[PDB]
Structure formats: C-alpha cells, structure tokens
Amino acid sequence: QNLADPAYRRRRIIMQNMRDEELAIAQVEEMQAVSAVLKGKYTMTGEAF
Amino acid sequence: TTAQLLAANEQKFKFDPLFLRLFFRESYPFTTEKVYLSQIPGLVNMALYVSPIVSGEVIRSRGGSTSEFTPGYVKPKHEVNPQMTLRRLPDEDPQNLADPAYRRRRIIMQNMRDEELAIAQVEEMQAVSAVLKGKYTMTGEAFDPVEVDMGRSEENNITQSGGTEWSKRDKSTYDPTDDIEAYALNASGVVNIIVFDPKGWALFRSFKAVKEKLDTRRGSNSELETAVKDLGKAVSYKGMYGDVAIVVYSGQYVENGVKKNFLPDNTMVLGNTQARGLRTYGCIQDADAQREGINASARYPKNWVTTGDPAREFTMIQSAPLMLLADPDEFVSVQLA
Amino acid sequence: QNLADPAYRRRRIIMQNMRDEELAIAQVEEMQAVSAVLKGKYTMTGEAF
Structure with missing residues (x-):
C-alpha cells in the first residue's frame, strides 16, 4: 500500500x-x-591498467 | 524569368474524432504497470x-x-x-x-x-x-502483440444473414422500425443515439414506412432531414427520430498512402450517449523524461542533436494510449446488410 | 490500494x-x-412443495 x-x-x-x-x-x-x-x-594492477 | 506565388492551398482529409468525444470521457492517467x-x-x-x-x-x-x-x-x-x-x-x-x-x-x-x-x-x-x-x-512490426479483450456477450454483435436483411426485403411495405426495437432489446440500459455509416443511412431512409412516420399529424413526434444536409463535414447531426437521435459519421484514417473510412461499410451502432467510457493513458518510458520528473502524461515532446556527418536534429512525440470501455455490452452493433 | x-x-x-x-x-x-x-x-407447484 x-x-x-x-x-x-x-x-x-x-x-x-x-x-x-x-x-x-x-x-x-x-x-x-x-x-x-x-x-x-x-x-x-588491473585488467585494463 | 520572374514569378510570384500568389496563393498556396493545403489538402486535408475529412477527420473528426466523433466516437472519442461522444462516448469516451473522464480521462484517467495511471502510474502503474497494469490496470484492472x-x-x-x-x-x-x-x-x-x-x-x-x-x-x-x-x-x-x-x-x-x-x-x-x-x-x-x-x-x-x-x-x-x-x-x-x-x-x-x-x-x-x-x-x-x-x-x-x-x-x-x-x-x-x-x-x-x-x-x-x-x-x-x-x-x-x-x-x-x-x-x-x-x-x-x-500490433506492429517492432511491437510484441498485445490483445485487449473486454467481455461482450455473444448475443450482441448482431449480424444479418440469409434471413432478416434489409436489402433483399421489399423497400415498400416494410417497417424498419420493428427490427430496430428487437435489436435494441438486447442492450443493457437505455439507448439514446444511433450512428449510421452513410451507405447504411441511405439504405434506411429509403423505406416508405419511415417516410410515413414523418408526415403524420399525431402518430409521431419524429423530425428528420431527409434531404441533403451535410456533404463535406465528417459528422451530420440529423433530427431526433422518435426518442433516439440519428447520426451519420464518415471519418477517414489513412494507413499507407490510401485513404480509408472508419466505419466498415454500412454498419449501424445502437448505443447510449452517456455510456461510461474510459480514456486511459499509460506511463511513458524514457530516461530523459523520468529524469525531468514526468510520468503518466500524454504527448511528451522532445528533440536532440546527433552531431552526425550531415548534422541533423530530430523530434519525437510519444503517448502510450489505451482506450477502454467499462461496460462493453451497453452498445448493440448491427451489420445491416 | x-x-x-x-x-x-x-x-x-x-x-x-x-x-x-x-x-x-x-x-x-x-x-x-x-x-x-x-x-x-x-x-x-415446485420441487418440495
């Protein structure tokens, strides 16, 4: 309600x-x-870094 | 060579929302997924x-x-x-x-x-x-089909057949009024208006008995306008015949390049002029509109620039309409062949 | 509601x-x-009467 x-x-x-x-x-x-x-x-660190 | 463009007219098709004005009032916009x-x-x-x-x-x-x-x-x-x-x-x-x-x-x-x-x-x-x-x-090409269905009894939608048709029967010595009453007995609630497709109107007024109902000193109070009244307008309110009024509607909707008529070739629709009709407008689905804060509105306009190779700025109206009928069996549709 | x-x-x-x-x-x-x-x-008449 x-x-x-x-x-x-x-x-x-x-x-x-x-x-x-x-x-x-x-x-x-x-x-x-x-x-x-x-x-x-x-x-x-990164996958796209 | 010089010139002047003295006059420049515009061509339109005879279009007038008659059934939507007469029978559908009290618009109700709703911010909900579905209505009941x-x-x-x-x-x-x-x-x-x-x-x-x-x-x-x-x-x-x-x-x-x-x-x-x-x-x-x-x-x-x-x-x-x-x-x-x-x-x-x-x-x-x-x-x-x-x-x-x-x-x-x-x-x-x-x-x-x-x-x-x-x-x-x-x-x-x-x-x-x-x-x-x-x-x-x-239905459409990019639209998943949805089928609205309001329960109307089988006893409505009277369609004439090998028996009880006006065209085949004699145009002299026959009372159209007798069938009209029998058809209107099937409705629920009083009936106060009749809508004729012009071919149906020409068929109906050709009876000599209906002519006799006009020129009787004390046998009726009906007053029509048998002669030509309107020849360009979409609607022609003719005089009241007995109790109910008489209406001839010839509107035009164009799908593809060719014009088409709304009413399907001489149907007659008994009905009530105060019939409860609903005019429901849904919720528009546009993230820009909802960011602006608007919902459940009809005709949300917008434009945008797409910075393409030839530039270009578009324009868009979106409405999401849905027309309902609270009591579907207050009318009686007749084919009248 | x-x-x-x-x-x-x-x-x-x-x-x-x-x-x-x-x-x-x-x-x-x-x-x-x-x-x-x-x-x-x-x-x-009727069914019980």
Missing part, C-alpha cells in the same frame, strides 16, 4: 548507486593504505 | 417454492470477476538536416525569400502538426474499434 | 444477501400476479 511514482524510484536507485561507488572507492583506498604500511611497497 | 476492470453478475434466482418442513438449499452469494490490461506504446518521429533548408520551399515567393534559418523553423513546425495528427488518428482508431466489436488487437 | 478490514466485508456481504432474497420474493410475487391476470388458473 501507498506506492510511489517511477520518478521517485529512479531517484532512489540513483542514490544507492552513488553510495555504492563511494564505498568502492573508499575500499580501494584502504587496501592501498594497508599494503603501504604493512609492506614497504605495493603495486596497482 | 471488474464486474459483478447481479443475477438473482427466482425464489422457488419450499415446503415449510424441508428448509434446504442455501443459495450461494454472488461474486464478481476481474480483468487486467496492458497499455500500448507509440512514438513517431521526424528529422531536419541542412540539405532540406537551402533549396527553397513551395510556400515562399521567388520574391521576398528568407535566410536558410526561417526555413528551418517552418519545417520544424509542420512536423509537430503531423506528429499530433498521427497520434490523434491512433487514439481514434482504438476508440472506434473498441465499440464496433468487443475486442481490438494492437 | 486502501483495502478494508474483513468485518466491513462481512457487513456488505450480508446486506447484499438480504437484498438478493428480497428481490427473489418480489419476482415470485410478480410472476404470481402476471399468471393470475393472463390466465384464469395457474399451478403453484
């Missing part, structure tokens, strides 16, 4: 999307930091 | 005699039925490119003339007019087809 | 039940009267 119009579903989808990218970036930053501290060196 | 329609039988059995000893046969409480539909979609488009704008237009004098930019604004408009006319034609075709027969099918 | 509680459903069901049997009795009465007017005599 008490549904919402699609113009609001689109906005909620957008907000959770952008939260997901922010969390992914923070996760990569922490994985970079820990390897920077735990060991003297680290490598940034 | 429901109905309750309302048939009560006769109270059969029961002895004051037996006391049995509890009677089942009546329950209804439902139906769900899915709206169709439609989106025509037009284009403009700088190849069109430079040569000339058939509507401007060799004198005067304008920069290749006025020409782009004029061309851009007439496209809007054509898009609106196409969408209106589709709406009217759905509206008319919903009345003649209970169901109508929406 | 905005569905109601079953007690209201029971109330409207019982009301339409009563309307149904009232109209059934009315139908029997009218058939009785019509048969009386049209023909002099009628049989008033």
